[PDB]
């Protein structure tokens with residue numbers, strides 16, 4: 001249930017608040033419109049292996 | 053690193069190396085942001101003057117991404133104790149900002165509750181460094197990485213001749229000859245989740261390297277997240 005079921009469908013952090021899943025992201029990312037995916041705000045975001 | 057493999061191009065970009073007056077590495081570190089490096093407090097008693105090098109995979113050849121940075125402020129945890137290595141954590145603020153590029157990027161800091169419930173319950177984490185390849189051997193010229201299983205807490209306490217505090221966790225193998233070693237101290241322990249890497253530990257100590265019935269002991273980063281946040285604003 002909730003965060004215990006596939007990370008609550010969140011890309012990164014999952015929290016259980018009241019009866020529902022609430023997703024969030026690390027510093028340097030913003031939460032997408034769908035409230036689940038995390039979008040890098042700029043070049044070389046934290047935690048990503050470098051390709052260029 | 054005993055056992056393991058080489059980090060391939062761009063795979064370990066958060067690796068930092070603490071270098072002495074002779075340009076020799078003595079400890080590792082993790083890049084947290086353009087101004088801050090995470091390391092072990094015990095590494096601070098290993099050199100009078102030192103600098104930090106990033107973007108390096110081979111200490112014997114110029115690759116194109118190497119950069120040396122001077123240290124402006126050293127912030128060591130005031131409760132660190134050499135007796136047990138409890139609170140083995142420090143943050144370094146650099147004089148000049150790190151310019152991110154191929155092989156140079158920060159690892160993510162996770163939130164405590166989620167990291168303890170979701171990251172630290174995965175099967176494995178990843179340790180890296182330029183440390184000794186054998187307990188009594190020499191340091192590696194190549195940057196190495198190694199997948200290390202999370203180890204049951206009760207099993208680790210039973211195997212240890214030294215106290216395991218609330219500020220430590222265990223990772224590695226019982227008999228398989230793979231582990232971190234001298235010179236890797238202060239380096240990164242990261243956990244992967246959906247292709248994003250989060251810092252979960254700091255290479256701290258061990259009774260020798262890769263010995264039978266003994267594990268690698270890491271500083272429990274999740275217990276220090278508020279502390280790290282305070283140190284990075286000052």
Ligand SMILES: CCC(=O)CN([C@H]1C=CN([C@@H](C)C(=O)N2CCOCC2)C1=O)S(=O)(=O)c1ccc2cc(Cl)ccc2c1
Nearest residue numbers: 134135136137232233234237256257258259260261268269
């Ligand atoms: C000269 C420094 C040295 O030899 C350190 N190494 C180990 C030898 C003893 N210790 C521990 C037991 C120790 O001295 N402590 C006393 C204070 O309380 C904590 C324990 C070592 O750490 S080492 O170079 O073989 C070494 C260092 C770091 C390691 C990190 C991991 Cl994850 C695994 C093995 C390590 C071995």
Ligand SMILES: [Ca+2]
Nearest residue numbers: 110111113115
């Ligand atoms: Ca090089």
